[model samples]
Target chain A: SVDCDGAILGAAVNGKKSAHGSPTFWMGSHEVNGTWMIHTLETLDYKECEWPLTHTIGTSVEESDMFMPRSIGGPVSSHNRIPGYKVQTNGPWMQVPLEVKREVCPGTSVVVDSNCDGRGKSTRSTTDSGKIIPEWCCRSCTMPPVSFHGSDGCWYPMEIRPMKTSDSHLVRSWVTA
Target chain B: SVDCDGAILGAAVNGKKSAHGSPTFWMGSHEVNGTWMIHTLETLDYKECEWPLTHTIGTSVEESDMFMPRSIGGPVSSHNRIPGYKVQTNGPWMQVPLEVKREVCPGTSVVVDSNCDGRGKSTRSTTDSGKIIPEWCCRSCTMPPVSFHGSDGCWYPMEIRPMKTSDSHLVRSWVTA
Candidate 1:
């Protein structure tokens, strides 16, 4: 087993939604042992807040839905037009999940859905009548998390990162002598 | 005639490029004392980090155009998608030349575009791409800034309130007395 040190990466929202398609996020990491890992956490929800929806009007939809990527080092995870996981939005603050970090033993990589939409879709869409559009986006998380087998035949753990706000503003403001 | 007070709002972007679209910023003053006035301003490009384009891949297609809304309030500047303003990669960020406060000075609003595609159209197709579809999200400033008349006869400035950072860690550390 390969012991890999992990840290919380960054979090982001898919500026765009599955209703409109086109979702993307970028994550970069400093490599150890001559191997760098890159992860992309795409946004799952798009029609977060729109007109007629008072709550979402002035809010930043990008900060709403957050998730982790299946591909760690290459092209983003766009399974059947689906991307990262879909987080629950009880409150705006709840939209972004808390970062988790733990050392993992390296293994073979296998593609799996972190946020599964059992119906076989990347996102969920609703019509003007508020009815869900067929195959709008990924359904919802159905199965447990799994990794993809990389070209190197490694089951790299899905290292989730922290959201943008993770960087301490005070610390950033603090002067380092 | 109603009296209206306007202030210049600030917006920030750290990554991406003009190629992605021009990110526009807007501020809204809602539910105010009976006053009717228009908000307008000229744009001055601020050099933050020279607009990094190293991450850009693929061709410079209009699919990634940018734009901003002229107003955030009023029927023309409703919270939802603006008519004829869809199709850009960067909606909301697209800058509308001059926004007329329109009728009620209450609840004045504005948005900005960062993408280049006028009308916020995406390169992918000619549809209201919304934010996901570049063409639907495209927007641009036209007709210089102007204060237009308000329709509906029911307009009011929006109520302004202080916002707390949603980040739990930050809120716990900084917000508490």
Candidate 2:
């Protein structure tokens, strides 16, 4: 079993590598409409991935939809490699069971979707009409947290710090320094 | 009586155009060591200009050293025209007394070289060792000023803002957007 933290995962669209794609981080999983979806962070921008629907995976070789890369091509296991595995070229789309446990910051309570609406409202959906779910997890601290103001004119806490680097040069260099 | 406010000025070293040169702004002048240096701001960076020793300019046609462009061929004024006057090339560096009224921000008392020292202390000297002079004037405002931290860990208001663009790609594109 591999730990998903800091793992780089690739994505494909309709079995083809996304043209504007980069490897994303595995952020764990979530269930939508009773169907589990492996939630991964988007690499090009700040967003979550919604593919390889959980029900698509199986426990046994005969049942599993995932397979490792072989001269004989087909669906493969997502669990075949550990974190930090690099994909050099476009390989066959392999299906893997979501096996890594979702790591949650301790002391932070999970806040599910609730009363919130309008743009910049902290909650978002995967699609135009998808269910409203928790934005992300967070924990309280005694010290005041640092935040960044987005071009959209909204303030976001450090949870979005990684995204800030990808989206803003000032923040990226500042953080790196 | 041409006003210097936003005029573009050029410089040459030992009669040759400086390779590391750009047009500079005329930020008025100051007298130092009994010789009037054409206190022009540095062309490449910062906000101050330093040049031409004042005694360098002469009053009589034969005495004046500055010259407008001529067929004889030598260094000439960077600009052929002045904001407030019409100049014909090949004319003498006609001595025109500093006639434009110095525009000063209102309500600030003029403080000439008395009680300040050290770098970043707001006060400055025109001569190598002259009296401290009034650091430029500024207006008061209510809103807290915003600033940027340089890679060198220095905090500057507008100066750092300009450098941020030079330092960060995202800031450059974001600001352009």
Backbone Cα, N, C clashes tallied per candidate: 100, 14
What DockQ results for candidate 1?
Answer: 0.02
Worst 10 residues of 1 chain A by lDDT: A168-177
**lDDT, candidate 2, residue A40?**
40
DockQ score of each predicted structure, in the order shown: 0.02, 0.00
**Residue A146 shift from truth in candidate 1, angstroms:** 7.0
Interface RMSD of each: 15.2, 34.2
lDDT of residue A86 for candidate 2: 22
List native contact recovery per candidate, as a fraction of 1.
Answer: 0.00, 0.00
- Candidate 2, residue B47: the lDDT equals 26
Write candidate 1's Cα lDDT for A41-99 as tens digits: 22322122211111111122232233231111112212111123342222111122211
Model 1, stretches more than 4 Å misplaced?
Answer: A1-97, A100-177, B1-177
TM-score for the first chain of model 2? 0.18
